[PDB]
Symmetry: D2
Subunit: 372 residues, 4 copies
């Protein structure tokens, strides 16, 4: 028996419920919708309507949310007017003992009846399994899709590695593997960065390449759009706070890029694995303000390659995801001071130090919950 | 006979002279090299050598240049440590009565023996010829090239027109046209923005499209890397001063994007035309830090769409290029106050205002030369 | 005989109308209150209350305001949510033909029944009279007041001249002078800059020193809080738009520091003079977050010394204030390119260029009224 | 025997040693001079000559310093081109077991022959002695001086407490106290902030009030210009790294305002005390870019009142200065997320988190020297 919770944060009126509730309803999944201060009241009605239609959906008011965060002594941890409020659902689903947490946006739509069943691969045991390795340490999950205009990389894929990646050796081998994170893919508008979207407005047409499980030492970015996490890894799945300036420019839109690398680094350290493939969602093409998305994403892009290079070198400690995550936060602070380059001004260094304190303030709430 | 001056600014040894002298020397072309402060002394030795071998090359000392500018009462117009120093070559070539000024980068190699002769297309006069018009006002000169990975747009091409551009209709009709700007294309690393370079890393394989002369009302960005300008249009070809911050971030790398749009706009006002196609140069793909290029171009890219929209609507006065350019400078200043959007903070608005003054200080310089 | 209009912008209740109204009503002077988008509607009640009670007050809506700025072709010249909207009062007052425009803040209250009559000193015409000069080119109007902790300088006084000022020689000659600006002083909280207020929180106990008329070449900042301008000078009294960044930090609180210097430099070019002294208002200590005031003024303060220096060496052209003001606006554009210092980054020079355009937009609006 | 080491970091020619070497040579004090990347080669000359006349002065090369910082595992702790290098002097003098470290600026000259001896008050122990308490929590050490124009506060004195401070009641009571920090005063140009120096340019003519020892809960800023620290307190005296932006603006010139408060807060936690009074140095008026000093200090000034207020409500832990300092670093991180106010942009909050990490890097290096 696998208890599953889907976490969404929305400032919509609740319409996404209509087409999203079926696959969760028929599967008996709980749906946590996290409203914000800028969430109009229609959302709450839409929930009680769908609860009446058989879906186990809850939707805690901001006042409820803040009460919980206040009792766990993390009152300022999670801002309002942010999709950071994600973290509230992660915490609630974990508090309540769910095995599988599925992180979604309110615009992603499952495309198959077995959406929940497939994300439950993260509840498989360890298995001798085909594992996918790349000579250069990276795997491009968009390679599993038919993408119309031209080949593309996912958002958060490092840039320095892209030119040579196509010449890298990809190998499949049977090894023991214990999947704890399932990153399901997306059709229509795929999770590419604002650079790529602006340059080729790609269209993901089909899921053609199956699924994969990345060998130790092979990484690919994991987003929070269509992603199952096993309850043991949830401590390392903290969605990072955006807004910190790099060279004076505030970063946005990369909170789940850090999180999807962090949970992934921790998992490998603990002998666990990340899977990419089904189930796939439908991500509609939002067509809003691509130049603004670029302006938001550039500060993080200017830092990520260096942060990812330094994480490889850095050995971690811990015997579960909380301890390893805490050790990681200290490593980021050592990296914040060791890294070098034009993007690394005082505010850019300081962004790491603040993020590390917020990561331990998060685990600290998980301990308070657990009496640790 | 038609007299031509190639203008190149550089901070290098002069080794580029070796593969660039042949075409110039055999045509009797003048090569103006603008050295900078951060320019080693090898270059000056390199020129004297090639001069001895027959190439009519000149290499005015920083001290020479600065005396010209003082004597013209524009001592602060042209910054140091910047490829803005092209402008001295432009001025020197104008001052000495050259018919055709070709703007180049020190790293662009001619690929044919009649390089100079082809750029003299700007010296044929008006005639009825095949003219190319687009239903959306834009032409994509990169479509005249076979580009390796996927279709691309040139640097400076507005972003709001890209998605729909493939659906515009293109017509070729016999109209009178007076070509005064010839933007030759590039094999290798084509002139795309940082966004496009990062996303697809395009390779320009061949110039298979022939040449086009853009109808009135159809525009395409014009760069300063492989571009001939008839001396009457030179006064509107001032390479814009970069470094003005947009919302805090200093813009760079777009001096010729504004200059190419400004000389085009003035040309069409005066009933002249821009040609795209041959002669072709090879542009070697030496990238280094693409992410820094991106950080530099984004501030200009955030304003350019709006600047272009207001330029389509803004009627200009003037009978020659100098009159029309000054009228454009005042138009930019009206636009600075009418435009609206998230990117148009006070420092973005003031950018246009200081550019406008710089533009008229340049034309004041040319006026002084011509009044004496 | 002499028509007088007072000009005040306010986001208040209209409460100040209370006690400000007497001195103006008995003198039958027009009071023009310019409300803003962020102003209360209680204000308009106050207005027509007094209009019954005998005071010729007129406080027009944002819409009438915008109607006029539209009919004068300057619909973007005066922003909202900013005391810059004084300028609407200046223009209306000029338009209607008042002889004497008195600029006030809504927290300054006359202290004598002759308030309007003392400000009318500006319609005396040329008459031989005592005139004061300082060998260093500066006069400290605060030395006309008794100030509580120690000696102070008015806001806008150049910092480089402060240490030596006590050793400058002051001299008085009787000579012909035509007073067109009357800058009356302040008791209670004197108009000092944020630096001074923070350091010594001065209190101006009395007006001990009588009045002075400054000789040509002798300057002192003039504010818009208790300052009478003669109709002919009002063209040059345009209140400068704040908000431009200097090194990324936007300036504020100095719109009238520039206008007071600009009207003054124009006046002296035309052979007119500035007076300081009676009538005295009371300015209540409303010290509201002095550190914020400091953070706002510092950008402007880092430029002003250099601006005043270059203004001394820049001779102007014009036969009236409009012409001279426009000549000034162009001098500033030269100065913006000639000056040097660490504060003179690209956005700080662009401040001068956008301001010059805004000043010529203001004179263009008045030309429109007059038929140039 | 009481061993004393004076620490100075300089970029000067070494001329200051003429007027400093006597009072220290006479006392057999060691003088540690920390040069920087940008220190002339003359300064090394000066040191060698001054040792030839008996001054035990040492001037370690930047290569020498960097070897020690690498061996302590802190190669990146202390930047170059910064008076932060002070810290190297503290570390060297603490390593060598000096009882008393006297932190100086290279332009602070002793006015008495008992300079060293007087600073040795820090090495007498606890005893019952006159102890000064203030009803408001603050003591203005400049009140011990005769100041020429008017009353002033020292650099780093909170701004909210200044208006009401003259109304505070001060008492002197016999109480046990243990003086571990001695802040000697300054004649000539007192240690004022840029605000004050610009406003009134104070001249400190005499030391008239004797010396005081502050009761628990009464604070006053302590600078690093003329300040003796006992051995045990040096771990808490790390001179804080400047350069972090507050709302885009880099803070500077306040490294010792923080250190002076951090050491003071640790001292009182440990039941130790701060002294103000003799001995006195002459601080010659330097007069250099005061508007730049102001631009540099304002960002720190915008945060300091809030930090101090939060420090009063934050209980610490530790049984020595290392432990108490590390405890303080963690309290700053909590404060960084609790404080509220306009200046508290993300970069300003992250400023505290990066500082705390550098504080713990500094204590870590001290622990490595001690094997603890
Ligand atoms: N709590 C909260 N959620 C938000 C906010 N803004 C966006 N979201 C949620 O974020 C998710 C998708 O965000 P979006 O901005 O549409 O990014 P895009 O699809 O990658 O371009 C959806 O679940 C939205 O409801 C906000 O201010 N507060
Ligand atoms: N005067 C001057 N020229 C420069 C400077 N930096 C680069 N250049 C020249 O600028 C032109 C192209 O520069 P590059 O950085 O190679 O960019 P790319 O045009 O995008 O390939 C070449 O002619 C260089 O010689 C500089 O600081 N001063
Ligand atoms: N129209 C308008 N007037 C304002 C605004 N803010 C302040 N004022 C006016 O500013 C005047 C007083 O100046 P203030 O900036 O408040 O402080 P002070 O310069 O230190 O005296 C009053 O007459 C207010 O009505 C605003 O947003 N819009
Ligand atoms: N190592 C180092 N020391 C510096 C630097 N700039 C100033 N100092 C030292 O700082 C001390 C005081 O410097 P000063 O410029 O006089 O600042 P002020 O007294 O606060 O106005 C002197 O001993 C200088 O030698 C620097 O870049 N590197
Ligand atoms: Mg989405
Ligand atoms: Mg598993
Ligand atoms: Mg993720
Ligand atoms: Mg190049
Ligand atoms: Mg032609
Ligand atoms: Mg050009
Ligand atoms: Mg006020
Ligand atoms: Mg008169
Ligand atoms: Mg004024
Ligand atoms: Mg000094
Ligand atoms: Mg100190």
């Amino acid at each position: 028996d696998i208890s599953t919770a889907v976490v969404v944060t929305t400032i919509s009126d609740g319409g996404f419920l209509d087409r999203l509730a079926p696959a969760l309803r028929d599967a008996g999944a709980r749906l946590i919708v996290i409203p914000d201060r800028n969430t109009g009241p229609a959302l709450f009605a839409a929930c009680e309507r769908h609860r009446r239609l058989g879906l186990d959906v809850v939707c805690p008011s901001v006042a409820e949310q803040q009460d919980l965060l206040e009792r766990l002594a993390v009152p300022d941890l999670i801002p309002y007017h942010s999709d950071n409020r994600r973290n509230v659902g992660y915490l609630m689903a974990w508090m309540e003992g769910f095995d599988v947490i599925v992180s979604m946006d309110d615009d992603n739509l499952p495309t198959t009846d077995d959406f929940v069943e497939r994300h439950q691969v993260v509840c498989q045991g360890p298995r001798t399994q085909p594992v996918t390795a790349s000579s250069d340490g990276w795997f491009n999950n968009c390679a599993l899709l038919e993408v119309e205009p031209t080949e593309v990389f996912p958002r958060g894929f490092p840039f320095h590695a892209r030119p040579a990646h196509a010449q890298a050796r990809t190998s499949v081998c049977e090894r023991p593997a214990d999947v704890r994170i399932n990153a399901g893919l997306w059709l229509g508008d795929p999770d590419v960065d604002a650079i790529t979207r602006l340059a080729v407005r790609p269209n993901a047409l089909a899921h053609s390449g199956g699924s994969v499980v990345l060998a130790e030492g092979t990484w690919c970015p994991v987003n929070s759009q269509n992603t199952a996490v096993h309850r043991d890894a949830l401590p390392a799945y903290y969605f990072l706070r955006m807004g910190q300036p790099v060279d004076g420019v505030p970063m946005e839109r990369f909170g789940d890029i850090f999180s999807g690398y962090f949970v992934q680094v921790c998992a490998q350290h603990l002998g666990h694995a990340v899977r990419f493939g089904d189930p796939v969602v439908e991500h509609p093409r939002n067509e809003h303000d691509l130049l603004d998305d670029l302006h938001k994403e550039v500060p993080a892009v200017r830092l990520l390659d260096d942060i990812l290079d330094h994480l490889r070198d850095h050995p971690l400690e811990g015997g579960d995801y909380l301890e390893t995550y805490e050790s990681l936060s200290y490593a980021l602070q050592e990296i914040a001071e060791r890294v070098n380059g034009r993007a690394w001004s005082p505010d850019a260094r300081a962004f790491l130090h603040r993020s590390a304190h917020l990561m331990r303030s998060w685990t600290g709430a998980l301990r308070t919950v657990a009496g640790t």
